[PDB]
Enzyme design. Structure first.
Site, PDB file in Angstrom:
ATOM      1  N   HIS D 200      -1.645  -1.443 -16.782  1.00  0.00           N
ATOM      2  CA  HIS D 200      -1.186  -2.528 -17.650  1.00  0.00           C
ATOM      3  C   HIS D 200      -0.974  -2.183 -19.128  1.00  0.00           C
ATOM      4  CE1 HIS D 200      -2.374  -5.686 -14.340  1.00  0.00           C
ATOM      5  NE2 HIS D 200      -1.289  -5.003 -14.027  1.00  0.00           N
ATOM      6  N   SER D 204       4.747  -0.763 -15.052  1.00  0.00           N
ATOM      7  CA  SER D 204       5.232   0.044 -13.980  1.00  0.00           C
ATOM      8  C   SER D 204       6.356   1.003 -14.421  1.00  0.00           C
ATOM      9  CB  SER D 204       5.703  -0.845 -12.839  1.00  0.00           C
ATOM     10  OG  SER D 204       4.601  -1.453 -12.200  1.00  0.00           O
ATOM     11  N   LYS D 226       7.853 -11.013  -3.058  1.00  0.00           N
ATOM     12  CA  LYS D 226       8.072  -9.649  -2.541  1.00  0.00           C
ATOM     13  C   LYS D 226       6.785  -9.031  -1.960  1.00  0.00           C
ATOM     14  CE  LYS D 226      10.207  -5.302  -3.803  1.00  0.00           C
ATOM     15  NZ  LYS D 226       9.068  -4.599  -4.511  1.00  0.00           N
ATOM     16  N   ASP D 227       5.628  -9.302  -2.608  1.00  0.00           N
ATOM     17  CA  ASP D 227       4.318  -8.830  -2.122  1.00  0.00           C
ATOM     18  C   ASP D 227       3.811  -9.593  -0.894  1.00  0.00           C
ATOM     19  OD1 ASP D 227       4.312  -6.759  -4.106  1.00  0.00           O
ATOM     20  OD2 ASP D 227       2.586  -7.446  -5.178  1.00  0.00           O
ATOM     21  N   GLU D 270      -9.214  12.299  13.423  1.00  0.00           N
ATOM     22  CA  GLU D 270      -8.225  11.223  13.175  1.00  0.00           C
ATOM     23  C   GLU D 270      -7.007  11.748  12.397  1.00  0.00           C
ATOM     24  OE1 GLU D 270      -9.759   8.782  15.407  1.00  0.00           O
ATOM     25  OE2 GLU D 270      -8.763   7.415  14.007  1.00  0.00           O
TER      26      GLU D 270
END
Ligand code: HEM
Ligand code: HEM
Ligand SMILES: C[C@@]1(c2ccc(F)cc2F)OC(=O)N(Nc2ccccc2)C1=O
Lengths: 111, 53, 106, 378, 48, 75, 53
Positions: D200, D204, D226-227, D270
């Site tokens: 922040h 971004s 969108k999220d 895994e």
């Protein structure tokens, strides 16, 4: 935020005292405007174009007197409530809310 | 001290918000009834009788 | 003087320019530069006309990138027409930093 | 004034999720951060409801997991949501890291360096959890990983015996691992908040790697919706795993109870650990192998120093793009070799893939960036 | 080995049918909000 | 923390926008959509695909070789 | 790029901080030796031989 909150407040929850103030302000505005040969002449010319008659001051009075809080809240809801505004912005306008967020200001989730 | 909120403006503001407060009450009651599958009310809803026996 | 080798050197440069593809978004080379401190100072020093042109070019490119679209081929920036408008500002900023760094040595 | 803007708590929510200036142009690849947060809360909720029924003794660990799956009402969905959520967590981790690599998001030094810590912390978390049901793979997986510490010169044996609480993986080890596995996702949650704080400061990055100050949009409604869509795609992929293929990523040997006396013939991680496992066993030396394994994850902390390009992102960089996709395919190759026996073609190709991993990052990608600069007369 | 087998698959159908509804609808919601941006026009009008 | 009003200086840019209620959520969805994905595929194939094919070839060789190594024919 | 930190000022700044860097090294080594009760070093310290046999 404050502008839209006032539109939303009036749509949902206009009280009587403030409507009387709004009524009186209009009564004063109308009589103050129609004062001089020039604004009265303009009013004759424009009214006959738009209305076809001159609507006399007593008629406007009767139309203003009719308006109460219920009338304000119905009539505001018809035009403001959950409606798409047109927005124009000119200048240092980076902090001007996104249109979606303006649109979201046109209704209240509590109502 | 809460004499403040007594007067004709506040009564009108009560009257304006009352259909909304009761409709929210309707949302909450039907919401609680749905989420708990509540027995007493939902036996009495004429479709949604999917207990039967 | 220099003819045949130069055009091939230019050819690989022009090939790479097209494969880079910032020109499909209407970007100039200097629009794509990573903003370090040297670069941010170079932007700051730009004249009014060049600064504002730079912003419009970025905006138009970010708009295209959001829509995952490109300009019509007509409107792509031609390698030959690509203006290195930041370079002389940036070069001078680098020269200034390097002098400070030499003074700090002694 | 708004309530949302100046209320001391709602302030923080406002600046993170509502009014946060976000790039107009951030893709699909930027969904993985919120998806990692969703993955964490999913692992928290299902995990707590598993902790309500799981017991952490060797005599009862397998049985309590069995009890969840037959007897506890809907214990099977919670158990499988958890197991497959762990896999979803690693799928999202890898997409997110890969985004960072390609788009030059690692130039946010502090944000990136905390993300590395986040990766090492979820790795430690998921290791200790996998031990918990006390299957065969649980035990020998516990054995192999814990013994990686014994390669450390002088202090190594003392360190492993300390983390065992004994001379092997035993009673003391399992209970330990339950306690550490409970605490660490809450530590993760705190480091994830610190991660978001550092981010922040800048906001971004975007696909273009160019500053997007000229074209910011509010996080809400755009990246809230969108999220949401991203989360429902995560739920689809998770539920496909739980309701149609619950054993697809599981080893069948973990359905046999832990035997301390006999290994499985195969022994494989895994899926998400198979590249690192391939890197370790590529080296014919004890210390060499573990050092290679450690360095295969810890290299991400050196990726900032090996940036050489005058452009942030790989969007305008075809050479680097080819070399990046060569890394991804090298990692696919390493995950293949990880899951296979230590025999004829697989050894030498496992060695070659291991060399190439370190060659791409340390040498080849920083040479491509320099060539690309020279090509653009920069 | 798997007493949940039958319940798992009934849930599985219920999931796919719900996701077949919910995925296009949430997509349509995101497309609605994003419309403002995806159809935006820019003009640059510098002096002279 | 960055805020609107404090980001950067922009001059002389007009943005025109329509309401979402005035407009299509899926405008020319197949007719413009599939040409775009085709154009995007073309733009990236030569960068993305050739590493994965080179994995696939090493995969198919490596599996074939190992299978064929685990056999005799004289003793 | 780290040619930046090469020159007579930086050598002098190295010389000024070197007794301090080595004294901190002395703090760290004696600190680690004390905290682990380290065997090799602490057998050789002529008081503090509280193992004996
Ligand atoms: C506990 C798992 C993690 C969580 C919850 C998480 C959280 C997120 C969030 C919410 C974002 C913003 C949205 C987005 O760009 O995705 C983000 C961005 C970022 N993350 Fe993470 N992250 C984690 C793992 C990592 C890892 C493993 C790294 C790489 C070592 C990473 C490095 C970054 C960077 C560099 C960005 C900036 C991206 C950019 O704007 O382009 N994070 N993180
Ligand atoms: C603090 C929240 C958490 C709690 C309380 C918790 C608790 C549990 C418990 C009780 C088990 C044993 C039961 C079982 O095996 O099904 C388990 C196993 C597991 N945990 Fe967690 N967990 C948490 C979050 C984590 C996280 C963040 C991860 C990493 C993504 C993780 C990865 C797993 C794995 C892989 C297993 C083995 C599942 C299996 O195959 O059976 N869990 N955990
Ligand atoms: C889940 C797993 C694991 C998770 C994260 C990690 F960073 C390392 C691991 F080994 O824990 C574990 O015991 N195995 N299994 C395993 C480890 C070493 C050799 C063979 C199997 C894992 O894959």
């Amino acid at each position: 935020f404050v502008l839209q909150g006032q539109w939303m407040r009036l749509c949902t929850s206009a009280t009587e005292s403030e409507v009387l103030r709004g009524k009186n302000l209009l009564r004063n505005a109308l009589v103050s405007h129609l004062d001089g040969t020039t604004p009265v002449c303009e009013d004759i010319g424009r009214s006959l174009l738009t209305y076809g008659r001159r609507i006399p001051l007593a008629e406007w009075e009767s139309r203003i007197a009719e308006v109460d809080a219920r009338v304000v809240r119905e009539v505001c809801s018809k035009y403001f409530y959950d409606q798409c505004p047109a927005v124009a912005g000119f200048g240092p306008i980076e902090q001007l809310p996104d249109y979606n967020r303006i649109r979201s200001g046109m209704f209240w989730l509590r109502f | 001290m809460l004499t403040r909120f007594l007067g004709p403006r506040y009564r009108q503001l009560a009257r304006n918000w009352v259909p909304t407060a009761s409709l929210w009450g309707a949302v909450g009651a039907v919401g609680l009834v749905w989420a708990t599958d509540w027995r007493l009310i939902l036996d009495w809803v004429p479709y949604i009788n999917g207990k039967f026996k | 003087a220099v003819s045949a080798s130069s055009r091939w050197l230019e050819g690989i440069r022009k090939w790479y320019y097209n494969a880079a593809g910032f020109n499909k978004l209407g970007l100039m080379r200097d629009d794509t530069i990573h903003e370090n401190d040297d670069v941010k100072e170079a932007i700051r020093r730009l004249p009014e006309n060049l600064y504002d042109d730079r912003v419009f070019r970025i905006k138009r490119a970010l708009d295209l990138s959001m829509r995952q679209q490109i300009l019509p081929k007509e409107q792509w920036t031609k390698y030959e027409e690509d203006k290195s408008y930041l370079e002389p500002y940036l070069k001078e900023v680098i020269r200034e930093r390097k002098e400070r760094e030499e003074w700090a040595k002694k | 004034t708004n309530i949302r803007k100046s209320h001391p708590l709602m302030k923080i929510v406002n600046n993170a999720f509502i009014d946060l200036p976000a790039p107009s142009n951030i893709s699909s690849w930027w969904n993985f951060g919120s998806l990692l947060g969703i993955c964490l809360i999913l692992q928290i909720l299902t995990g707590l409801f598993l902790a309500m029924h799981y017991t952490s003794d060797t005599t009862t660990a397998f049985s309590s997991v069995t009890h969840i799956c037959r007897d506890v009402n809907y214990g099977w969905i919670i158990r499988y949501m958890h197991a497959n959520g762990a896999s979803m967590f690693f799928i999202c981790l890898y997409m997110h890291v890969g985004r960072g690599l390609y788009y030059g998001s690692y130039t946010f030094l502090e944000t990136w360096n905390i993300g590395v810590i986040l990766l090492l912390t979820v790795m430690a978390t998921a290791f200790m959890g996998y031990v918990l049901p006390w299957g065969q793979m649980s035990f020998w997986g516990a054995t192999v990983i814990t013994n990686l510490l014994s390669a450390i010169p002088y202090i190594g044996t003392n360190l492993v015996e300390w983390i065992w609480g004994g001379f092997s993986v035993d009673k003391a080890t399992l209970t330990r691992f339950f306690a550490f596995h409970f605490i660490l996702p809450f530590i993760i949650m705190a480091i994830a908040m610190v991660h978001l704080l550092f981010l922040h400061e800048t906001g971004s990055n975007n696909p273009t790697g160019i500053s997007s100050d000229v074209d910011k949009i509010p996080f809400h409604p755009y990246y809230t919706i969108k999220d949401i869509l991203g989360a429902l795609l995560l739920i689809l992929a998770l539920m496909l795993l739980v309701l149609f293929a619950p054993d697809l990523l599981g080893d069948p040997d973990n359905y046999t109870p832990a035997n301390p006396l006999n290994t499985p013939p195969h022994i494989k991680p895994e899926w998400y650990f198979l590249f690192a496992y391939a890197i370790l066993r590529s080296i014919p030396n004890k210390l060499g192998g573990v050092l290679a394994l450690a360095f295969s994850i810890l290299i991400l902390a050196l990726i900032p120093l090996l940036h050489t390009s005058k452009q942030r992102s790989m969007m305008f960089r075809p050479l680097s793009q080819c070399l990046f996709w060569a890394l991804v395919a090298d990692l696919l190759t390493l995950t293949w070799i990880g899951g296979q026996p230590v025999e004829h073609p697989y050894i030498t190709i496992g060695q070659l893939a291991s060399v190439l991993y370190f060659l791409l990052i340390l040498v080849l990608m920083p040479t491509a960036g320099t060539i690309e600069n020279k090509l653009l007369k920069w | 080995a798997e007493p949940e087998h039958d319940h798992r698959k009934r849930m599985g159908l219920k999931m796919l049918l719900m996701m077949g509804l919910l995925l296009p609808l949430v997509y349509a919601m995101k497309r609605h909000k994003w419309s403002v941006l995806k159809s935006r026009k820019l003009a640059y009008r510098p002096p002279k | 923390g960055r805020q609107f009003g404090h980001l950067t200086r922009v001059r002389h840019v007009i943005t025109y926008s329509l309401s979402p209620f005035e407009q299509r959520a899926f405008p020319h969805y197949f007719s413009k959509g599939i040409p775009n994905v085709l154009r995007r595929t073309r733009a990236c194939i030569l960068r993305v695909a050739p590493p994965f094919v080179a994995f696939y070839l090493v995969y198919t060789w490596g599996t074939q070789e190992f299978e064929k190594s685990k056999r005799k024919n004289p003793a």
